[PDB]
Amino acid sequence: KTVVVTTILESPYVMMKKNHEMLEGNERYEGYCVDLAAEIAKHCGFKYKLTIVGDGKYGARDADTKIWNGMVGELVYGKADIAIAPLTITLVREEVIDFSKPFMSLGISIMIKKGTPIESAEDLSKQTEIAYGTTDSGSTKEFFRRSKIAVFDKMWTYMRSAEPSVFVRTTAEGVARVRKSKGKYAYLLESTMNEYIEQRKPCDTMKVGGNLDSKGYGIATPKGSSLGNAVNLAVLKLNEQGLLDKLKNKWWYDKGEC
Amino acid sequence: KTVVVTTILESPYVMMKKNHEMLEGNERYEGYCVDLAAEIAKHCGFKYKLTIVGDGKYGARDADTKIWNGMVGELVYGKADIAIAPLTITLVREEVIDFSKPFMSLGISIMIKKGTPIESAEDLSKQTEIAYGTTDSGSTKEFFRRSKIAVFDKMWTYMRSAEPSVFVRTTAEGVARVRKSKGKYAYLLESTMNEYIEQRKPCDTMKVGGNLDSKGYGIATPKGSSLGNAVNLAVLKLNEQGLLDKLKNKWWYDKGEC
């Protein structure tokens, strides 16, 4: 009956509302994905319940245990019926779950503390004073791990061996490390969120260079789910109507602090 | 079973090779989609024949007969097994055919001669001296037809009633019209092509302003096709391998002549 939506607490997609403690259910959260979830449900005609993924991860398969974690995992093991989050459409994930066409287009990028002498990935690879890393269990980390491109492979070879760890558990943790490391730490994260942070006080971070790749986020459902077809048509319908662009402007730029 | 591939002669996606005269079959053509078709065929393990869409159209549904034309029509009516072309993933099309995840990200844009006083869509809508139109039977013409957004809607009302016709049969016709119109004609087409033409002699056109939307091109197969699954995963693999980006630079900028 009520569709269980797995999502992640990640600003500006899903965030705890100001006085959420005084509210119930879906009304406790606000964000791009909360707005989208409400629309996807309206158009597909289903009641739903927003839920925050238990392990706070996007989703990766543990080689060896072979168990999927994050939102991907909740879909795979049947804990949730659908995932509405900034979840990247990738091959290893599409092999175990279904994705609608993209609702947002983006790519990996470099976030620096303003003033950092770095202008590209090539710059990062060619040096060592400035450490750099990615978010722990997801598509960005897999991108470098699986890359055959010289620059990206050089970066992986360093990152995978760097001590202490250059990987962070969450985006907030990477942004903080960037802000606190006095230009000695750069962060590899998707452009959508790099751009978001660039507009939030203290306005001390910046996105540099072009995107490392081009890809998208999709609404995910368990393989062979009944919701798949309709959510995909809903996504296409809503993008064509301009809602998705309207929502990015709302959560990114209208609410800009810089 | 040799796979019949429907595609369209559209630079730099598919073009007749210089020495096509004494060449046969697939060898007669070259371009981004020619390499892409070879790549996907390789990964999906099938033999194929490139064939040019008979009516030279991307694909639109006649409102009276409800009959589909273009590459979409060839797929719907079983004249082709797969379409490998710069074909845009849209709702009306996704309803009759299947599309893999995007192999290219893009958006509708504005092509001006060069030196013409137009900075954006808003500019076009506020004047009458400079005529502007789109290509027929495709997603761009649909974008404006079904657009509730003030500027785009206003633009449609002008283009629809326009006399003479501001719509063109092919992208080649639109580019020629912009080039010969002494800046009195602006063309609405996708960013991918706008940026391609911008890098080709006589170097007299230019893309102005940002894209009007964000979408993607997908490899299309007829509903319930056996090829669907594999081609989708192959597209994902190729994008992640970095091949699509390799192909983009090859046919767009390495060959750039401006």
Ligand SMILES: Cc1onc(O)c1C[C@H](N)C(=O)O
């Ligand atoms: C959001 C976000 O931003 N940078 C990132 O790596 C992520 C996580 C990424 N979207 C994933 O699905 O793994």
Ligand SMILES: Cc1onc(O)c1C[C@H](N)C(=O)O
């Ligand atoms: C290519 C291209 O470039 N501008 C355009 O309108 C098109 C056609 C568009 N890709 C379609 O599928 O109709």
Ligand SMILES: [Zn+2]
């Ligand atoms: Zn709605």
Ligand SMILES: [Zn+2]
């Ligand atoms: Zn290959």
Ligand SMILES: [Zn+2]
């Ligand atoms: Zn007719």
